[PDB]
Design a protein around this ligand. Sequence first.
Ligand code: ACO
Ligand code: COA
Ligand code: COA
Ligand code: COA
Ligand code: CL
Ligand code: CL
Ligand code: CL
Ligand code: CL
Ligand code: NH4
Ligand code: NH4
Ligand code: NH4
Ligand code: NH4
Ligand code: NH4
Ligand code: NH4
Ligand code: NH4
Ligand code: NH4
Ligand code: NH4
Ligand code: NH4
Lengths: 399, 397, 398, 394
Amino acid sequence: GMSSLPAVYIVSSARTPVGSFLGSLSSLTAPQLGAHAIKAALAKVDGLKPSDVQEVFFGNVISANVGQNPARQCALGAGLEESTICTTVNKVCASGLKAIILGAQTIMTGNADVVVAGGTESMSNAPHYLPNLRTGAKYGHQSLVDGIMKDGLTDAGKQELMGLQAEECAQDHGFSREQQDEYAIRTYEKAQAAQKAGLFDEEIAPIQLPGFRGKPDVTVTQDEEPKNLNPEKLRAIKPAFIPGSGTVTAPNSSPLNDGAAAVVLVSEAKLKELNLKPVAKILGWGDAAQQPSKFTTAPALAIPKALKHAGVGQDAIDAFEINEAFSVVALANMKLLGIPEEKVNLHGGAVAIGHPIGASGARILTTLLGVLKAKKGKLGCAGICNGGGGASALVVELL
Amino acid sequence: GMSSLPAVYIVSSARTPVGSFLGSLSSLTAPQLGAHAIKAALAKVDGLKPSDVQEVFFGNVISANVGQNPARQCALGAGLEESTICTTVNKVCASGLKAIILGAQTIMTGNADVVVAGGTESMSNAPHYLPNLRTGAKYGHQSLVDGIMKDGLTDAGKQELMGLQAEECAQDHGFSREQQDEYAIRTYEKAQAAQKAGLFDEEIAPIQLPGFKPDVTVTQDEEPKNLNPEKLRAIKPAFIPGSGTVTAPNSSPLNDGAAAVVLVSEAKLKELNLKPVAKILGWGDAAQQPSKFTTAPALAIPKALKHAGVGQDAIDAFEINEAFSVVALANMKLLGIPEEKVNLHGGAVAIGHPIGASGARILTTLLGVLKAKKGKLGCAGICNGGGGASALVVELL
Amino acid sequence: GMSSLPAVYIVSSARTPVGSFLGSLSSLTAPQLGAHAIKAALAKVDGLKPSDVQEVFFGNVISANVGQNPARQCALGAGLEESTICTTVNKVCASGLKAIILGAQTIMTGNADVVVAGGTESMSNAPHYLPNLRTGAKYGHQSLVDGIMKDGLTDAGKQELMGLQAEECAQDHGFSREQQDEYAIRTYEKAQAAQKAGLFDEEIAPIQLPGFRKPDVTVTQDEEPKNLNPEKLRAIKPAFIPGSGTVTAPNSSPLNDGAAAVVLVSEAKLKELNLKPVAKILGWGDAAQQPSKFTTAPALAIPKALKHAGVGQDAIDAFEINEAFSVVALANMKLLGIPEEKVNLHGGAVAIGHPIGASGARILTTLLGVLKAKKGKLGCAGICNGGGGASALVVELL
Amino acid sequence: MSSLPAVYIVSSARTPVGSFLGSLSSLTAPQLGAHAIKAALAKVDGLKPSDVQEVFFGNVISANVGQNPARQCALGAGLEESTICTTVNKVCASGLKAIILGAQTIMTGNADVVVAGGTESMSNAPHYLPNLRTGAKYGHQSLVDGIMKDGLTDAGKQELMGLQAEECAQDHGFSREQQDEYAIRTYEKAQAAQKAGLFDEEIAPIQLPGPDVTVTQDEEPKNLNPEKLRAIKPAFIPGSGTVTAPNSSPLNDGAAAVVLVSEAKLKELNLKPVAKILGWGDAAQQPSKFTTAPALAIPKALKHAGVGQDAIDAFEINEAFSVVALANMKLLGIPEEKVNLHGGAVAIGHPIGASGARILTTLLGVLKAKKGKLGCAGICNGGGGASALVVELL
Ligand SMILES: *CC(=O)SCCNC(=O)CCNC(=O)[C@H](O)C(C)(C)COP(=O)(O)OP(=O)(O)OC[C@H]1O[C@@H](n2cnc3c(N)ncnc32)[C@H](O)[C@@H]1OP(=O)(O)O
Ligand SMILES: CC(C)(COP(=O)(O)OP(=O)(O)OC[C@H]1O[C@@H](n2cnc3c(N)ncnc32)[C@H](O)[C@@H]1OP(=O)(O)O)[C@@H](O)C(=O)NCCC(=O)NCCS
Ligand SMILES: CC(C)(COP(=O)(O)OP(=O)(O)OC[C@H]1O[C@@H](n2cnc3c(N)ncnc32)[C@H](O)[C@@H]1OP(=O)(O)O)[C@@H](O)C(=O)NCCC(=O)NCCS
Ligand SMILES: CC(C)(COP(=O)(O)OP(=O)(O)OC[C@H]1O[C@@H](n2cnc3c(N)ncnc32)[C@H](O)[C@@H]1OP(=O)(O)O)[C@@H](O)C(=O)NCCC(=O)NCCS
Ligand SMILES: [Cl-]
Ligand SMILES: [Cl-]
Ligand SMILES: [Cl-]
Ligand SMILES: [Cl-]
Ligand SMILES: [N+]
Ligand SMILES: [N+]
Ligand SMILES: [N+]
Ligand SMILES: [N+]
Ligand SMILES: [N+]
Ligand SMILES: [N+]
Ligand SMILES: [N+]
Ligand SMILES: [N+]
Ligand SMILES: [N+]
Ligand SMILES: [N+]
């Protein structure tokens, strides 16, 4: 039903390299990564100034110790004006894409004409928690809570790691250890091929880390995870969540990662005022939810909803991004929707690229735009599940 | 500009009592408080079921150790369907009002017909943080970070507590210690008067706590009773020794609480023949230099008024959030709003300030003020750390 | 074999009140408690100056965050000279008595003529530990280790709390929940009757807590004895085994703060300064067995100490068998054939408190008072310690 | 002098001394202690471990080590559950005071076979959270580094030992350069002893389960870099300081143990004694002057032993800092030609609860290599104390 609503255009997008856990980007905070992606995205739009950006929505899940309003720090660090309206969004893994939806809605209701939306996550710098210090604990051992485990990866109702609910997904939909492993191998091979062909070069903004006291500068140019594929070692590794008979493993699951992505949205009127060249048009979107432990297949609800909102049939989509929280998540949603893997994650997915949870919703959108360009497509759809039972999805047209 | 767009109706609101820091509600988590407010608000809507709610936006600032997606936990805790779309919102103190704005917009773009929005905060249960445990620290004493200070009350760019930037406001706009104290006494008096007259009874959803002694029912806000005028005037300053003007009595406290509103489209109102409490006429966000966040409402309130097509002089009551007494004094000065139209049942200095919920808390109180004082047009404005503010214009029906 | 060795005389003893966990003395550090007991004991010796103390041995178990050499801080806090030799001793619950033995041996080898020995513990101010912050721990929940549990109350081998091994002592030697409870009640009533007759007045040095910018507080009494409630005691749940448990919080010793000290002198120094000796050390004995059997290790240390002193078990007028748990005193009375009517005549640690690093010296302080009040000459003190050990000491009241 | 029964050392042993978070950091303090006790006992032909009656073991930072570190050392070494075990803390002097108490227990007849020494795992010293029981309602809190609090900070003045080392440099007139040249000389002496196999006998190598790794050498002596050492910035007083990390002792892991027997037990079992304890001396003075407390304890030990200072063939003066060795040599008139002949802790390592026993094991090796007979070990401790011991090599 977006035909009746004002149009929203993507005029640029950019992402950081995705760094490994405690890896290439672990020295940077989440707002520094976010600032980097925002600044890089704005620098691609000819005829737009960063001072033109009126409002920011930015996803961030594990915000502990990031400081007041992560999104605000992202905006100011990227050089945006202090007049810019900033809001931090948390829909767990869907945060980065819900941020873009809210951004588009803010243009559609006429409250802004230029919006930056995206997400960022530094899982390396997620802290540990001491919960009982204010009132005290008179006697007994206490727990230092891992913020990643508690606020990012554990279902609140069942107190179950997402990995265990991924095993619930493999059981419900009949995917073996071997099927998940061979999917993971294929998505690494796609990510390495895209890397080698330079197909991430446009979307990635390399990061320059100046050296400290005499030490040499470091440039981080590529995602860290794709090169780690060892097929023999992958097929032989122990399961990560269920001993012995488990089907989910560290290699066939998304890793923990650091990264950020950002898109620049403008109204039809601003496109005309500044004579900007749009990259893409947002056609529609959809959020959906179901039983929390079945979050893995919520995209099978969000994607049809988004396609209906956009007025597009599933068969007209040229490329899908289905976020690979786990290999089995992509396999199960492909099966439920009847989407062949030859249309899914054509440059690889999060199992091979990395999964900075608050950024991945926007990261897969930047990659999708690069896939449509490289494969000469027009219609694309991104969908991402989130712990708690939800999923979000968005449909774009490349222009 | 909102008058060209689909109408958004408030059909109910509710709030928890506001508990003191480590006080009457400290045993409850932020989602338990949020669920309580949401359930209470929906119970007031004749002809609407909890299963009609399609989407939830809920503010929450200090989310550490609250678990995955605090808004989702509030929704499911309140008995909403697992189909409900849930998003947590952080705009620091403005979070609870920005959540309501986002819910209105979601109705206006046609993606929902029934939306719950608000905020919650449990400052009592904010944890401390241990950084650097992943990489290690070879040798030396290490710090445990107070999450309230870090993620709630410290300006990121200058690493200054909000109360130091309140001093900046008093210096910038010329408000003395005495003017701030007299303002604080007046707003405590208004809160106590409203308390005794029962004017909070409708908006407050009391909380029953089992005993660890017999059971306790929390029915009143905890802070208003603490006013001691003589002690307030004599206490030492809280952020600048000797010369400071900002004190703990004349600042907002740390608090626990939640508030929720139920929003519906015109079509849903007509389909179910719902009785609206209020109509959203417009809103506005604004921002300026981060250490000047205290007077960002002087930008957001005219923006919300223009968006609603309502002149400032037609507003019957304002809610200017009292992050500090000097914040209300400064914004009243800059906008030329008489205090006789401001926080008529008291403000956060006297009631409490659960940061993620206060933007929604003041809207709930505003609806009550408009009814009690027989007003029609209200405006709520709230500032937030980082330099921002949010404001909303409503019409009581 | 103390007959051919130099004689060691006790010229004074003193202890703090024993405060409950997070209770009346919780604002004081272990060296503040220890300095208080040292200073008070010296104040009792007519003709001796604090500057005459040459060496200090002080027990302390949970020494984390206490700072360098707890014993040295106790000595200096009490006003002893910076020339004073100071060593901190840890034999868990036996620390305070082993310190006295080591002080006695140092006089016997001629290396000192005046020694202060004892023990202190602030279980209140025992910290928690963060053990992997140096190397780091990349992912997962971590533990904050309770220092009382880890360094005070857990057997290192089998990783069990002392209370669980107390149950083992109940099973091994056949004592019921009710028998332990009736022992607990009796020792509480003995503690309360001594409190009421002022029989602790001489050994306790009251503590004055200066009020901040707030009234002063004087702590005069041990805090635990008044807590006896026989109906609640007999009806409380077990504290270490949910189902068949027999060991309870009321019939175990509590967590406590306190210090005690004694002043030791050689034969030649006693005469040179013309001091009235309170008692004479006749012998001592350390023993050890299986760690989880530490409860009955005093049944070895006590006969050993008696043999070392040349005195017979039936000659002893009063015994102090320390009450780590009610069942500990019951089992040691059973094995050794000692009637309860000669054991802890003013109550025991179950009712008085158990500052683990101090209790070995606290019970000797109380034993000297039991000997004076009950008209006795020979006394033996015994105390087990976690890990399987025990220490015992024989004294003659003069 | 003393008129006490004879106490003989029938053996000694030490672990290699590992660097802070280095080659031994995986091991706990009682694991290192047990390793040293077991190796020491295996060297006495005719004595079984079951003959050990009592143990005194030094350990300073005992946080998170568990009940009675000395007991864990004894049982870990395979000693009988009947063995009496006491843990001793006299800060850096703990390992030598432990040996003194062990000797005294033989002398009063309460034992005929005593094991004594010390252990320390500074790598595994934890951090403290001090106010969790009563709580802290608002505000950033602090985690205490256990090393700094219980090992290296004078309780009176809240000053690290290095700052009081600067006080030593100023009091007795020792320059940055003089402290550096002492440091290089002691590193050189330790490197030479290493290459000549002179630590092979005293060191009991540690086998770590992997590929498996074997620790055979002290880790610190290879670190000497004279250029960097003379150029590095001071570590306790910026700009003008004289004390540095290279000329100070490091943080280290390690244990050492000695086996003591009475005359009667030596005769009954026909044991060949390594040495005889002749005397000892503890002394103390102003806490911030702990650096020169050995200048009191050494004369005291010598007098107790009936030995004049000039008759000592070799001294071990523990090198808590380079300036500590300089100041005590200057005050006692001891020429550097007779001090720490195989290097000291500035080059070897300084696991504080073990160092007092460590230098005694090394002193026995120095006396044998240098054809000496009378040796004296002295070690200062934070808080103002020092301990010293005199042995005769047999
Ligand atoms: C009661 C008593 O007896 S007191 C004795 C108790 N122990 C102590 O007092 C320990 C005192 N020492 C310390 O507290 C620490 O070791 C200090 C803080 C002094 C050293 O910490 P640090 O981080 O500065 O030391 P390092 O990590 O080892 O780095 C030092 C720096 O200097 C280089 N370097 C070390 N040793 C060298 C030698 N022998 N030769 C040449 N260079 C050396 C080292 O490579 C480092 O250089 P960088 O390149 O800057 O890292
Ligand atoms: C699964 C998880 C616990 C990782 O555990 P981990 O074992 O420590 O992960 P690692 O990086 O150490 O990988 C383990 C092993 O697999 C190897 N490995 C990793 N990726 C590999 C690959 N593609 N090919 C071959 N080997 C691989 C590693 O080399 C390592 O081998 P090793 O045992 O010899 O060291 C963590 O990544 C996780 O929880 N992921 C899920 C994230 C998530 O849930 N996101 C949100 C979804 S809703
Ligand atoms: C100001 C602040 C630090 C409180 O500090 P505090 O020292 O703990 O203040 P307290 O609540 O403990 O009360 C201090 C004294 O004032 C008294 N007091 C509190 N409210 C009073 C009142 N209304 N009238 C008279 N006396 C009062 C108390 O009785 C207390 O007395 P005491 O010293 O004898 O105990 C904290 O509440 C704060 O940071 N407020 C600002 C929070 C904020 O920034 N919110 C977001 C804004 S953007
Ligand atoms: C056993 C231990 C865990 C106590 O745990 P605890 O339950 O928290 O102890 P508490 O005193 O707080 O609780 C005791 C309960 O019984 C009551 N109680 C305690 N002593 C009582 C007494 N003499 N008479 C009647 N009631 C008593 C208390 O009122 C309390 O009642 P409540 O349920 O209403 O709160 C702890 O004290 C311990 O480990 N002791 C062993 C000491 C030790 O190991 N020493 C060295 C070994 S060698
Ligand atoms: Cl959800
Ligand atoms: Cl802002
Ligand atoms: Cl033992
Ligand atoms: Cl000392
Ligand atoms: N790029
Ligand atoms: N992976
Ligand atoms: N209803
Ligand atoms: N109500
Ligand atoms: N207040
Ligand atoms: N007394
Ligand atoms: N008790
Ligand atoms: N042997
Ligand atoms: N050896
Ligand atoms: N060194």
